[PDB]
Design a protein around this ligand. Structure first.
Ligand SMILES: Nc1ccn([C@H]2C[C@H](O)[C@@H](COP(=O)(O)OP(=O)(O)O)O2)c(=O)n1
Ligand SMILES: Nc1ccn([C@H]2C[C@H](O)[C@@H](COP(=O)(O)OP(=O)(O)O)O2)c(=O)n1
Ligand SMILES: Nc1ccn([C@H]2C[C@H](O)[C@@H](COP(=O)(O)OP(=O)(O)O)O2)c(=O)n1
Ligand SMILES: Nc1ccn([C@H]2C[C@H](O)[C@@H](COP(=O)(O)OP(=O)(O)O)O2)c(=O)n1
Ligand SMILES: Nc1ccn([C@H]2C[C@H](O)[C@@H](COP(=O)(O)OP(=O)(O)O)O2)c(=O)n1
Ligand SMILES: Nc1ccn([C@H]2C[C@H](O)[C@@H](COP(=O)(O)OP(=O)(O)O)O2)c(=O)n1
Ligand SMILES: [Mg+2]
Ligand SMILES: [Mg+2]
Ligand SMILES: [Mg+2]
Ligand SMILES: [Mg+2]
Ligand SMILES: [Mg+2]
Ligand SMILES: [Mg+2]
Lengths: 134, 133, 133, 133, 134, 134
């Protein structure tokens, strides 16, 4: 039993795909443990969430995009939730993400890619603490 | 432009219909402006939410049901959001709710009925202050 | 709590709408308690099922249609199942069936209308004994 | 058997609901007999299409909206296609359109309302000749 | 043209996924040849169906689960139906079943995995005879 | 930014899968640039579209099938649209096309396979000129 951190990104709201994405995880039988709606996340939270990317050329565009509309942060719980939700998410790159995955069916850009999911136990703990410090 | 308060009820979690219900409202172009997940809503909030029914025969069972699993409280915004979302919701009574409505398609019980929606401007304002004080 | 008899008609097989129709009833939380697949229903069962219409102008065409492909006969159980599933079904006449109903959304003919549902307690009991003797 | 003229409006493209809308009509078993994609419809065609509304207060905004993005014009064929597709469409006014209808489920504005459908035999014939001369 | 045996398992009924699963096979254009609804299958039928697993540690839990609610048995017919329905089904293991498959989208446990499908011509013949001995 | 040529084939009309297929491409955020409905495409257009297959044993059956009912021709535009729509389409062979793809979920025959999509920049230019010579 693991918990992972998922963000629904501002592009899902712009495109009205919030329920679609959440529904895919719900149908796979993962349970919401906590959830927060952000009309706009503070840039500092975003910078912390993506701290590993601070030296990448896309860092600033990525932070601007993540504060460009609402976000929902969600903690999901389930056996092997971290790896499983990552497989449902699909690859970052639109040339690679597989039909059947969230990104494979729905996303067409490497940046506006609808959804974040923690990639490991270490990072899940970290990201959960950022979005749900309580 | 109006704001209305929606609760996703514990039966929606139990039957995995949370996204289905939220999706119907999202597809109608209504925007979330607040949302809170409650693993278990406090009895007192529930009793205040339904204070109008406090002397009704079904009150205790209603309150018991409403604390029997998680709920999501959401404020939705849109032109005439209150009446329009009430229309989406459908009649409380499963003998009357129309196919095409949330309850008409999905609910089979007058009590386990998936969703709450504010029924007027004044009750919307009240319910919003209960869930998002 | 009631039991009702539903037939999935041959047009549903032809148009691949079997799961779509059964899904609408399943999503309304009704439970299957019996079900039989008929690659081709016997003429006599069909004629007994529709015995009330035996002198109607459409009887032979109705019976011919009903043996023109497979059918599934299902008994569904739930509180007020009879009237509620009738409500899901929609009006026989495609000029009257409401969007949101099975027929309102999917059927375009008064005859090729996808689904049978028992119309009362007494007819439910009768139809159930025909298909599941 | 009848032919009716449907326009998929620019809001459907903007909100990615083109297939959703066409799908509802396809599932009702209506057949496309003509279809044209317009990256931008000519003002004059739009003004002729809505010539009945030319003196209405909303005319210019309506025409402006209708040239604000792509449209698809489609001729659909089926028994009683005109009235049946009008029934699928739903009321212009989002306070009145029924859940289960295209507008009842998807539209939130009296103007940005996703779809046009001919309202009678005579207007169908007229509209068809405008879009498919 | 082949026939394969499919079981809709008790978890599909518990979770109201019966139509969802049948719909996926129906949309792929496979035809129902026979179908039986079981309010509860007799344990002996289950033990016969899973006879190859009789010495596995999960055998008894598997039999208990399969008699824990209803089952629908179905014979589907179509060109290469056996291998094709297996690919739609998805892998047994939730760490492996691919998004887009029935198990990949819907199942989250190696045991409660919604659906059985015959894995070969030899086993299809066998399983069809168990569920439809006529 | 690329344009690709898609045909919705007569089997999609016969099976009422037109919107289903178009919807999958629409949901991936590709834009229609041009579109033409053909009550029946002229056999010569079909023969030109499939000119590379003229010596294959299936050539005549393929042309007969393509004129057997309506077709919609569509030009779709988007970053890497050609390769991306090909991945959504799925493999020609029903023993290979993956669940989650259009063919993987919906097609059960190597010939009646619902959808054409250009396979390269060179062929897209070519096919666009055939269906939209303007
Ligand atoms: N080449 C890249 C890589 C990442 N990004 C953005 C989009 C990604 O969601 C975030 C984080 O990248 P990461 O490599 O962790 O990708 P995932 O979101 O976990 O799939 O950065 C980008 O815009 N361009
Ligand atoms: N006869 C009744 C009436 C109401 N309830 C429960 C179910 C209802 O959602 C709540 C509130 O009742 P109300 O009449 O306000 O109905 P709505 O939720 O607005 O449709 O009480 C009940 O269990 N039995
Ligand atoms: N005018 C009519 C009336 C009925 N039928 C056929 C189609 C109907 O499903 C059956 C049974 O008619 P009935 O009036 O009982 O209609 P329902 O199936 O209950 O809606 O007869 C017909 O073909 N033409
Ligand atoms: N009060 C109104 C009435 C109509 N319009 C626009 C929206 C409508 O689709 C068109 C045509 O009006 P009409 O009354 O024919 O309505 P329908 O499209 O047939 O439902 O005009 C408007 O913007 N405001
Ligand atoms: N490690 C395992 C393997 C199988 N089972 C159960 C679940 C499987 O559906 C059945 C039969 O296993 P099998 O290896 O034939 O798997 P499939 O159902 O064909 O994918 O046994 C289990 O509970 N744990
Ligand atoms: N063995 C084959 C190969 C192709 N065809 C038909 C079906 C294919 O859609 C067309 C064109 O074949 P091609 O190899 O280009 O396949 P795609 O449509 O691009 O996947 O020919 C066939 O009937 N049998
Ligand atoms: Mg990452
Ligand atoms: Mg109330
Ligand atoms: Mg009747
Ligand atoms: Mg009008
Ligand atoms: Mg096996
Ligand atoms: Mg090719």
């Amino acid at each position: 039993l693991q918990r992972t951190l998922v963000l629904i990104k501002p592009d899902a709201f712009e495109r009205s795909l919030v329920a679609e994405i959440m529904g895919r995880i719900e149908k796979k039988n993962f349970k919401i443990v906590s959830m927060k709606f952000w009309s706009k996340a503070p840039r500092n939270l975003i910078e912390q969430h993506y701290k590993e990317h601070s030296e990448q050329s896309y860092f600033n565009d990525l932070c601007d995009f993540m504060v460009s509309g609402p976000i929902i942060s969600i903690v999901y719980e389930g056996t092997d939730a971290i790896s499983k939700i990552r497989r449902l998410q699909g690859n970052t790159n639109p040339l690679a993400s597989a039909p059947g995955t969230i990104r494979g069916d729905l996303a067409n850009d490497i940046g506006e890619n609808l959804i974040h999911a923690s990639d490991s136990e270490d990072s899940a703990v970290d990201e959960i603490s950022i979005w749900f410090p309580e």
